[PDB]
Amino acid sequence: PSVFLFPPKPKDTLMISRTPEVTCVVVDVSHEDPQVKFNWYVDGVQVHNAKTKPREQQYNSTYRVVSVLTVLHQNWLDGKEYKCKVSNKALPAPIEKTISKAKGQPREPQVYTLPPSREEMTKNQVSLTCLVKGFYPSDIAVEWESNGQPENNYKTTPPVLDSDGSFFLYSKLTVDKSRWQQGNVFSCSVMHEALHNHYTQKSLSL
Amino acid sequence: PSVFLFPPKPKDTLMISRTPEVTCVVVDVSHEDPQVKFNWYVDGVQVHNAKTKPREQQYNSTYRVVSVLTVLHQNWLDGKEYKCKVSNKALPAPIEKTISKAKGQPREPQVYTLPPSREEMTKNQVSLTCLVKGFYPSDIAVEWESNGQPENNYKTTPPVLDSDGSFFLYSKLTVDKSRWQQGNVFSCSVMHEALHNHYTQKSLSL
Amino acid sequence: PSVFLFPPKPKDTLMISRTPEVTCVVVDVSHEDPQVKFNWYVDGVQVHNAKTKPREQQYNSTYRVVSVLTVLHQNWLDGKEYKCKVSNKALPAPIEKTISKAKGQPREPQVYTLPPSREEMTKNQVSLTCLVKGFYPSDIAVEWESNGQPENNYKTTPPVLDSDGSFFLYSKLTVDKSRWQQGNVFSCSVMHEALHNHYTQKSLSL
Amino acid sequence: PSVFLFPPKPKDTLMISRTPEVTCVVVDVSHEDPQVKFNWYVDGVQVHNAKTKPREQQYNSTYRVVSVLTVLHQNWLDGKEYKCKVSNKALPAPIEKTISKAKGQPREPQVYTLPPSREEMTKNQVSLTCLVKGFYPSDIAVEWESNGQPENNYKTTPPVLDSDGSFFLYSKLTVDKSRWQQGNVFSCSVMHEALHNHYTQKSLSL
Ligand SMILES: *[C@@H]1O[C@H](CO[C@H]2O[C@@H](C)[C@@H](O)[C@@H](O)[C@@H]2O)[C@@H](O[C@@H]2O[C@H](CO)[C@@H](O[C@@H]3O[C@H](CO[C@H]4O[C@H](CO)[C@@H](O)[C@H](O)[C@@H]4O[C@@H]4O[C@H](CO)[C@@H](O[C@H]5O[C@H](CO)[C@H](O)[C@H](O)[C@H]5O)[C@H](O)[C@H]4NC(C)=O)[C@@H](O)[C@H](O[C@H]4O[C@H](CO)[C@@H](O)[C@H](O)[C@@H]4O[C@@H]4O[C@H](CO)[C@@H](O)[C@H](O)[C@H]4NC(C)=O)[C@@H]3O)[C@H](O)[C@H]2NC(C)=O)[C@H](O)[C@H]1NC(C)=O
Numbered sequence: 001p002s003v004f005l006f007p008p009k010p011k012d013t014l015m016i017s018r019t020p021e022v023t024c025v026v027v028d029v030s031h032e033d034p035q036v037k038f039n040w041y042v043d044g045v046q047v048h049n050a051k052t053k054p055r056e057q058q059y060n061s062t063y064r065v066v067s068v069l070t071v072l073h074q075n076w077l078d079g080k081e082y083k084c085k086v087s088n089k090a091l092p093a094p095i096e097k098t099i100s101k102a103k104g105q106p107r108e109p110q111v112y113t114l115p116p117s118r119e120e121m122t123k124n125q126v127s128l129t130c131l132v133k134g135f136y137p138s139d140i141a142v143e144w145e146s147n148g149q150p151e152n153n154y155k156t157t158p159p160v161l162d163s164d165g166s167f168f169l170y171s172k173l174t175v176d177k178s179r180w181q182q183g184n185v186f187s188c189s190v191m192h193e194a195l196h197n198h199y200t201q202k203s204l205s206l
Numbered sequence: 207p208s209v210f211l212f213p214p215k216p217k218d219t220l221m222i223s224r225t226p227e228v229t230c231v232v233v234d235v236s237h238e239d240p241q242v243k244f245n246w247y248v249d250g251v252q253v254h255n256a257k258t259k260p261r262e263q264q265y266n267s268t269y270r271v272v273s274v275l276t277v278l279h280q281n282w283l284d285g286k287e288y289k290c291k292v293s294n295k296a297l298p299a300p301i302e303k304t305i306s307k308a309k310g311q312p313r314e315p316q317v318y319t320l321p322p323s324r325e326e327m328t329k330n331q332v333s334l335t336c337l338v339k340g341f342y343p344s345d346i347a348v349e350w351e352s353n354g355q356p357e358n359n360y361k362t363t364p365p366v367l368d369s370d371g372s373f374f375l376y377s378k379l380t381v382d383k384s385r386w387q388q389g390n391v392f393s394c395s396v397m398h399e400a401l402h403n404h405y406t407q408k409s410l411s412l
Numbered sequence: 413p414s415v416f417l418f419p420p421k422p423k424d425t426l427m428i429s430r431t432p433e434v435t436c437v438v439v440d441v442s443h444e445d446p447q448v449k450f451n452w453y454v455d456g457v458q459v460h461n462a463k464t465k466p467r468e469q470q471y472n473s474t475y476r477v478v479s480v481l482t483v484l485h486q487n488w489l490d491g492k493e494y495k496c497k498v499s500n501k502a503l504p505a506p507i508e509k510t511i512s513k514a515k516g517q518p519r520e521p522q523v524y525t526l527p528p529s530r531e532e533m534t535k536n537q538v539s540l541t542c543l544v545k546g547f548y549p550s551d552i553a554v555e556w557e558s559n560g561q562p563e564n565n566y567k568t569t570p571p572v573l574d575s576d577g578s579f580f581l582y583s584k585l586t587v588d589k590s591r592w593q594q595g596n597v598f599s600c601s602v603m604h605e606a607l608h609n610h611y612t613q614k615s616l617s618l
Numbered sequence: 619p620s621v622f623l624f625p626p627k628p629k630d631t632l633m634i635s636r637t638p639e640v641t642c643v644v645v646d647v648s649h650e651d652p653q654v655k656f657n658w659y660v661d662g663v664q665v666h667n668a669k670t671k672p673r674e675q676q677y678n679s680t681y682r683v684v685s686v687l688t689v690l691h692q693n694w695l696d697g698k699e700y701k702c703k704v705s706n707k708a709l710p711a712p713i714e715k716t717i718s719k720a721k722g723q724p725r726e727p728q729v730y731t732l733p734p735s736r737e738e739m740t741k742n743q744v745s746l747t748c749l750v751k752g753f754y755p756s757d758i759a760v761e762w763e764s765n766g767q768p769e770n771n772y773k774t775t776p777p778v779l780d781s782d783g784s785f786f787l788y789s790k791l792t793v794d795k796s797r798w799q800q801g802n803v804f805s806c807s808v809m810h811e812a813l814h815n816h817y818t819q820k821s822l823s824l
């Protein structure tokens with residue numbers, strides 16, 4: 001019987017709108033010793049009931065019981081260590097897996113905007129590109145805006161480790177040629193931990 | 207013995223960095239019946255221990271006991287009704303004061319930037335002005351940036367009710383003439399509930 | 413039982429036609445000790461009967477007795493300290509609340525009128541704005557005139573302290589686009605203590 | 619006991635000099651039932667001995683037995699389905715995991731090379747970028763050359779699915795400013811299934 005802690009999705013931490021949650025999961029819960037008793041400790045103080053809220057589930061030939069605890073942004077972004085202390089009878093001595101954003105003197109993500117190669121103009125749909133480099137840690141979200149209104153045709157590579165011990169990632173927003181020539185202004189937003197107001201925006205036009 | 211609920215400061219709600227808190231206070235707590243027992247209910251479910259955390263305090267010729275409960279942005283911005291149910295013996299039937307951001311189909315704050323009257327150029331320190339109008343509700347924060355770096359010399363009128371049932375407010379950033387002539391770019395940021403990404407920025411230059 | 417002194421409205425002080433009055437008010441006057449005896453002292457000499465003139469009034473579960481004393485412009489603008497010395501039997505030692513408007517070197521507000529950001533022109537109703545800065549003390553009132561006739565659509569932020577130890581405040585007069593383009597002449601009037609003839613007017617047009 | 623099939627590395631498939639191999643691996647092989655009997659079938663006909671060649675290995679508290687089969691370029695690029703049929707006594711009915719790379723009409727990536735945003739020039743190290751889009755299937759590898767000699771400072775995002783059902787990926791080669799200004803010629807090489815000679819190269823310079 002082994003435990004697994006799950007950090008929250010980025011998007012949900014960086015925004016005041018969402019509810020980011022830390023997830024703890026237990027798999028391989030023997031039919032004979034089905035009792036699992038979760039114990040959550042926030043940094044140090046037990047958050048007891050806090051928000052923990054499981055359910056049981058039959059699976060493989062075993063069980064999978066998942067218990068969830070809500071997290072306060074503030075605390076997370078500030079590194080409060082979150083701890084899961086799960087207990088069973090089959091198990092010998094309760095397992096205690098832990099999890100916190102990975103400490104690490106943050107690096108202010110650099111963000112540039114790059115236009116389509118003359119070459120691409122040859123086709124009926126050009127492609128704009130905004131590289132987001134040298135930031136830390138991975139957590140970060142990118143979104144595109146052509147005005148106040150944000151666009152649809154766009155994807156975002158996940159991050160890769162650079163040599164700096166830094167991070168970088170790209171994002172494409174394919175756009176119908178006309179648009180681009182008709183010199184419209186586009187902007188890719190980058191929300192992250194170190195951006196002064198957890199945000200910065202750049203723009204591409206003609 | 208009467209109770210008073212206190213909504214959180216704007217700044218602390220709109221940002222993922224801060225810890226916005228709802229404050230409940232009891233004044234006029236008779237020397238003979240000093241026992242006050244707080245009961246907090248979130249929307250409906252009692253948050254029992256949640257985060258409540260008071261202390262007693264001798265004052266006037268009476269007592270003032272303040273108990274505080276932490277609030278999750280999400281929930282607040284979404285209107286969860288927060289309720290304080292205070293009880294004493296002197297008091298007849300516990301008092302139950304409540305409090306939630308004031309419902310009200312929000313209005314996307316319009317934000318413009320205005321330069322100094324030719325007339326002001328006459329002095330050794332000009333003044334830039336960004337009006338923030340027609341938004342709702344009052345909650346909103348304004349900050350100034352000349353580059354990535356944010357400035358110091360600046361104040362922000364509180365809001366006033368307009369005819370629209372809307373709100374508006376101004377903000378000055380006095381700046382040394384040279385600066386202004388040396389065509390530097392300035393920007394006043396407006397963080398609010400309805401701004402797509404809870405933010406928008408405008409700029410003033412030459 | 414607690415007393416509250418009320419300085420006169422600005423308009424009423426700065427003009428020779430109005431009668432500006434200082435108001436003293438008593439709240440929570442216990443049904444058993446309803447006797448309240450007003451004692452007015454101007455600067456030093458008791459103004460005894462002067463113009464004091466109350467009446468009694470039953471309220472929530474208490475009484476609220478208001479007594480008023482007329483003030484001479486001259487004396488006020490010159491700083492004569494006005495004092496209210498209220499006495500009751502319930503109360504221990506009569507309360508003596510005082511009131512004079514600000515101490516110090518009044519300063520001449522300098523006023524500028526500013527037009528609507530081109531951007532605002534995009535809408536069906538532009539907005540004119542006249543900042544009134546660097547004045548002392550807060551006392552001051554603003555009024556709008558598009559001709560000899562003054563307008564209606566307009567509000568006035570209260571003052572905020574600046575760094576000069578000075579004061580400033582703004583005022584909006586939203587106006588329907590056409591009229592503004594139709595190059596009409598508008599003026600925001602500023603009545604204050606240090607304006608030569610306790611007034612000054614500026615205008616905005618095309 | 620569970621089996622895992624491993625497709626060959628791209629470079630090894632697209633080139634006539636390398637030997638690309640499909641790998642089959644068995645984990646959690648119980649100390650009591652350590653007998654694992656590998657059965658390889660190419661597309662349909664069992665390749666019996668073919669080239670299969672394992673060995674046993676003790677691990678955590680279990681065994682991990684890896685057996686490898688060499689693959690003919692031709693057959694692979696043509697889609698021959700490769701199958702691993704592993705059997706043990708502990709296990710109930712042998713596991714048969716399969717593996718062939720993608721089905722469908724491969725598509726010819728179109729490649730563009732893009733320069734660093736003027737803005738980047740502000741720093742001590744610019745960054746070159748060549749987007750590789752609209753290709754199928756994911757299989758593909760990129761390499762950088764500044765001459766005949768290929769560089770080191772560079773990473774390569776994995777692919778992401780686009781809307782065409784196509785694929786695209788980027789690759790950064792940070793380079794010290796001077797060199798870029800010193801107008802040196804750089805080229806990013808793209809080896810893939812549909813590139814005429816399973817290759818194509820583009821260059822960036824001044
Ligand atoms: C009997 O059956 C059970 C389930 O049955 C499955 O069977 C298979 C065949 C399948 O086809 C289905 O039929 C069915 O799912 C078995 O349970 C499994 O038990 C495994 C252990 O034996 C366990 O392995 C771990 O898996 C980890 C990740 O697995 C992902 O993939 C699953 C399927 O795609 C998915 O369901 C999982 O949830 C998980 O994906 C991510 O899960 C998050 C939880 O919800 C989720 O988070 C969300 O959270 C917020 C909250 O609202 C919000 O929802 C967000 O959207 C979201 O972020 C993620 O989104 C979600 N992703 C997706 C795409 O949904 C894997 O990481 C583990 O790796 C570790 O184990 C190695 C092996 O021992 C170690 O060597 C490694 O070190 C590693 O752990 C390291 O930990 C270190 C510190 O913690 C790190 O430094 C290091 O980086 C880690 N290493 C790595 C490389 O990760 C591990 O393999 C399975 O997850 C579990 N399945 C499920 C679903 O529970 C059961 O075991 C069976 N019995 C047996 C024993 O055979």
Ligand SMILES: *[C@@H]1O[C@H](CO[C@H]2O[C@@H](C)[C@@H](O)[C@@H](O)[C@@H]2O)[C@@H](O[C@@H]2O[C@H](CO)[C@@H](O[C@@H]3O[C@H](CO[C@H]4O[C@H](CO)[C@@H](O)[C@H](O)[C@@H]4O[C@@H]4O[C@H](CO)[C@@H](O[C@H]5O[C@H](CO)[C@H](O)[C@H](O)[C@H]5O)[C@H](O)[C@H]4NC(C)=O)[C@@H](O)[C@H](O[C@H]4O[C@H](CO)[C@@H](O)[C@H](O)[C@@H]4O[C@@H]4O[C@H](CO)[C@@H](O)[C@H](O)[C@H]4NC(C)=O)[C@@H]3O)[C@H](O)[C@H]2NC(C)=O)[C@H](O)[C@H]1NC(C)=O
Pocket residue numbers: 210211212213214215227228229231233234265266267268270
């Ligand atoms: C014995 O002494 C006690 C204290 O002693 C005081 O004595 C005086 C003379 C003083 O000089 C000192 O010696 C000492 O302070 C007495 O206690 C007082 O009891 C009063 C009742 O008798 C009570 O009146 C209410 O006051 C409300 C606001 O008062 C502010 O001002 C205080 C002093 O400046 C300040 O300390 C208060 O805290 C409060 O200011 C704001 O307080 C928030 C609480 O901390 C604070 O919030 C923060 O929260 C976050 C959390 O971290 C973060 O900290 C943020 O930074 C921050 O936002 C605010 O910042 C803080 N502001 C500042 C500048 O710090 C007043 O609003 C009440 O008005 C209501 O009452 C009227 C009369 O009955 C009603 O008619 C009105 O309707 C009104 O209630 C309405 O409610 C509706 C719905 O709720 C609304 O629709 C409507 O808008 C409301 N109306 C209005 C106009 O408000 C009320 O007057 C005093 O506050 C209390 N003082 C203290 C400090 O507790 C005790 O009473 C004495 N015995 C007696 C009976 O004589």
Ligand SMILES: *[C@@H]1O[C@H](CO[C@H]2O[C@@H](C)[C@@H](O)[C@@H](O)[C@@H]2O)[C@@H](O[C@@H]2O[C@H](CO)[C@@H](O[C@H]3O[C@H](CO[C@H]4O[C@H](CO)[C@@H](O)[C@H](O)[C@@H]4O[C@H]4O[C@H](CO)[C@@H](O[C@H]5O[C@H](CO)[C@H](O)[C@H](O)[C@H]5O)[C@H](O)[C@H]4NC(C)=O)[C@@H](O)[C@H](O[C@H]4O[C@H](CO)[C@@H](O)[C@H](O)[C@@H]4O[C@@H]4O[C@H](CO)[C@@H](O)[C@H](O)[C@H]4NC(C)=O)[C@@H]3O)[C@H](O)[C@H]2NC(C)=O)[C@H](O)[C@H]1NC(C)=O
Pocket residue numbers: 418419420421424431432433434435439440471472473474
């Ligand atoms: C009962 O009840 C009540 C409640 O109320 C309610 O009720 C109901 C039933 C009815 O009946 C009524 O009453 C109401 O509705 C009570 O009483 C109340 O309350 C209180 C007491 O407690 C008071 O006081 C408070 O508040 C205030 C405000 O007020 C104001 O406003 C209002 C509104 O509107 C009004 O009404 C009033 O009056 C005021 O004002 C006004 O008045 C004046 C005079 O008359 C005016 O003027 C006039 O005159 C002139 C001459 O020339 C001219 O003519 C003009 O035109 C006119 O008009 C003005 O203008 C007006 N305005 C308006 C608004 O309208 C406040 O202020 C206060 O406050 C205080 O406290 C706080 C806290 O503590 C603070 O903050 C502040 O500040 C103060 O104190 C102090 O002060 C100082 C100065 O600045 C400072 O510095 C310091 O610091 C402070 N301290 C502290 C602590 O802080 C208060 O609070 C009220 O008012 C009342 N109401 C009425 C009616 O009035 C009672 O009590 C009960 N009973 C029992 C329970 O006991």
Ligand SMILES: *[C@@H]1O[C@H](CO[C@H]2O[C@@H](C)[C@@H](O)[C@@H](O)[C@@H]2O)[C@@H](O[C@@H]2O[C@H](CO)[C@@H](O[C@H]3O[C@H](CO[C@H]4O[C@H](CO)[C@@H](O)[C@H](O)[C@@H]4O[C@H]4O[C@H](CO)[C@@H](O[C@H]5O[C@H](CO)[C@H](O)[C@H](O)[C@H]5O)[C@H](O)[C@H]4NC(C)=O)[C@@H](O)[C@H](O[C@H]4O[C@H](CO)[C@@H](O)[C@H](O)[C@@H]4O[C@@H]4O[C@H](CO)[C@@H](O)[C@H](O)[C@H]4NC(C)=O)[C@@H]3O)[C@H](O)[C@H]2NC(C)=O)[C@H](O)[C@H]1NC(C)=O
Pocket residue numbers: 624625626627630637638639640641645646677678679680
């Ligand atoms: C014991 O323990 C262990 C743990 O671990 C650890 O430990 C230690 C002690 C040591 O010893 C070791 O082991 C380590 O460290 C265990 O085992 C383990 O774990 C597991 C089992 O459980 C496994 O598996 C998992 O993971 C995976 C990953 O893997 C990968 O990676 C890694 C890292 O590195 C490696 O190692 C491996 O191998 C892999 O890969 C690799 O390999 C291959 C082959 O060899 C390669 O290739 C090669 O070959 C070629 C030919 O030509 C060439 O030569 C090249 O060059 C070479 O290299 C490759 O490349 C490599 N790579 C790397 C990375 O390196 C994963 O994958 C898996 O996953 C799964 O599951 C999940 C969940 O479930 C999912 O998601 C996925 O997906 C999968 O499944 C499935 O799949 C499919 C496909 O896609 C899908 O669709 C589906 O959906 C799915 N399902 C689901 C549910 O979802 C897994 O998880 C591992 O691996 C191991 N490790 C090792 C060593 O390996 C055991 O178990 C224990 N015991 C007991 C307790 O029992």
